[PDB]
């Protein structure tokens, strides 16, 4: 009967977010971040030696690729006969390097290409990339498994000896375009010898070929100085001992 019309009531005051839940979300996010970053740091620490070795391997690959590309660019510029396989470090003279049956010489193009490529490879090896990663050059010999074994071995050995003669025989056209230091460098960077058997090609005429396969230091080799030897200055011109007239 005598109620107060002016009695007021509090509004619909919705409460705030409970601070615990947002703080807990903050803490859980911080913990998730901590575990992520600790995993990243730990994995980067355990494998840092592996990472450094892989980086060095990639750098060696880049240097070798650059040197091979420079050498093959020089070959393309100078002589079309010289084709370079940078994938597996092979110098090929396919058409000019064919060997007929039971002979160890080559046509004129074989010698032209060989005596043309030797100075180019010497120049490549004399560069800083060569002075850091280039070892001596291996002459590749190939023989088939048919017939008498030792006849094929003797044929390949005579082919290698003929290649080395042609590189370092008197009156050769290369000898007229060479200096003493370059001749010494050829003597140091080249060894003649090596035989192999393979069945990766469809024709037996392919095995009758010669190739240049340069090989490089490993990452942990790093040009052991004690391995290098020395030769005296040339006192008399070299003479090939294979039977040229045959």
């Amino acid at each position: 009967m005598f109620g107060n019309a002016f009695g007021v009531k509090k509004r619909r005051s919705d409460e705030a977010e409970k601070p615990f839940w947002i703080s807990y979300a903050d803490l859980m996010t911080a913990m998730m971040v901590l575990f992520l970053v600790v995993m990243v740091a730990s994995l980067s620490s355990v494998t840092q030696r592996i990472q450094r070795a892989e980086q060095g391997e990639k750098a060696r690959g880049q240097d070798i690729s650059r040197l091979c590309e420079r050498l093959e660019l020089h070959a393309r510029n100078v002589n079309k006969n010289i084709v370079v396989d940078c994938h597996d470090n092979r110098i090929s003279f396919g058409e000019a390097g064919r060997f007929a049956h039971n002979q160890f010489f080559l046509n004129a193009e074989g010698q032209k290409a060989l005596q043309d490529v030797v100075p180019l490879v010497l120049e490549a090896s004399n560069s800083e990339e060569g002075k850091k990663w280039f070892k001596q050059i291996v002459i590749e010999g190939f023989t088939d498994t048919d017939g008498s074994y030792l006849y094929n071995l003797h044929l390949s050995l005579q082919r290698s000896e003929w290649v080395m003669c042609s590189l370092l025989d008197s009156r050769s056209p290369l000898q007229k375009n060479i200096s003493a230091e370059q001749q010494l460098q050829i003597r140091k960077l080249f060894l003649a010898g090596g035989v192999s058997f393979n069945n990766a090609k469809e024709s037996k005429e392919a095995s009758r070929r010669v190739e240049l396969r340069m090989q490089f230091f490993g990452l942990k080799d790093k040009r052991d100085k004690a391995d290098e030897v020395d030769f005296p200055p040339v006192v008399n011109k070299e003479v090939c001992q294979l039977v040229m007239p045959l």
């Binding site: 009967m1 803490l27 901590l34 730990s42 620490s45």
Partner: protein
């Protein structure tokens, strides 16, 4: 700047054990403050309400005056003294001419007793429920701060500069995380316990306050205004015929 690095060197220099100890100590102090200022106070309020209900349920058959002085002498507490004074102002005493004098024959209630012995005046304000209902969030926040600070200490200690130091660094960081989680776990356990006790105390206090006000409401009857209006209407209707007669 260098200011941030300097302070980070300053904060993360303390031993990892000092952080859970600080969290535990501060959370325990806040829990003790809760027990003292809130739980014991709420228990005292509940027992006071029970005692007051017993006395009111005891004068239910006394004369209206005797009831009135008994209730006046019963309520001796600032909030309840004021509430009783206002409630007594709300009561309408009816006088009838007996023995040549005006004597109280009946006391009528014009407002419910809960309008004066309300929850805010008797429970919420004495218990500071506007503050203590947010204490568990404060406790959990203290624990989270302790955990964060321990995590900074642990992360500052973590530095595996060698592949052979990775396992030791990871184990030490997990130990520091263990310390920080100890602080957080204690704080959250205390917050849950505080929430349980605080909500239970509110429920009990509200139930017993309802019983108290129901006891007070039962002493007096309402509807005096409608009775007065009915009497006035009857008097006017009779007065017309009185004038005519």
């Amino acid at each position: 700047m260098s200011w941030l690095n300097s302070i980070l060197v300053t904060l993360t220099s303390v031993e990892p054990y000092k952080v859970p100890v600080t969290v535990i100590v501060t959370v325990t102090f806040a829990f003790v403050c809760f027990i003292f200022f809130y739980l014991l106070r709420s228990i005292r309020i509940i027992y006071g309400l029970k005692k007051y209900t017993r006395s009111i349920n005891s004068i239910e058959k006394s004369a209206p005056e005797v009831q009135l002085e008994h209730l006046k002498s019963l309520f001796q507490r600032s909030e309840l003294k004021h509430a009783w004074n206002e409630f007594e102002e709300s009561l309408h005493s009816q006088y009838e001419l007996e023995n040549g004098e005006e004597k109280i024959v009946r006391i009528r209630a014009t407002a419910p007793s809960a309008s004066f012995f309300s929850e805010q005046q008797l429970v919420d304000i004495p218990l500071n429920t506007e503050f203590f209902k947010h204490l568990p969030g404060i406790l959990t926040g203290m624990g989270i701060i302790g955990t964060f600070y321990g995590l900074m200490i642990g992360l500052n200690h973590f530095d595996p500069s060698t592949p052979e130091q990775v396992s030791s660094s990871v184990n030490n960081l997990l130990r520091d995380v263990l310390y920080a989680f100890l602080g957080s776990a204690f704080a959250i356990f205390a917050s849950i316990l505080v929430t349980w006790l605080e909500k239970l105390s509110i429920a009990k206090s509200y139930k017993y306050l309802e019983k108290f006000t129901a006891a007070l409401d039962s002493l007096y009857d309402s509807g005096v205004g409608e009775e007065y209006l009915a009497s006035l209407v009857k008097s006017s209707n009779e007065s017309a015929t009185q004038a005519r007669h």
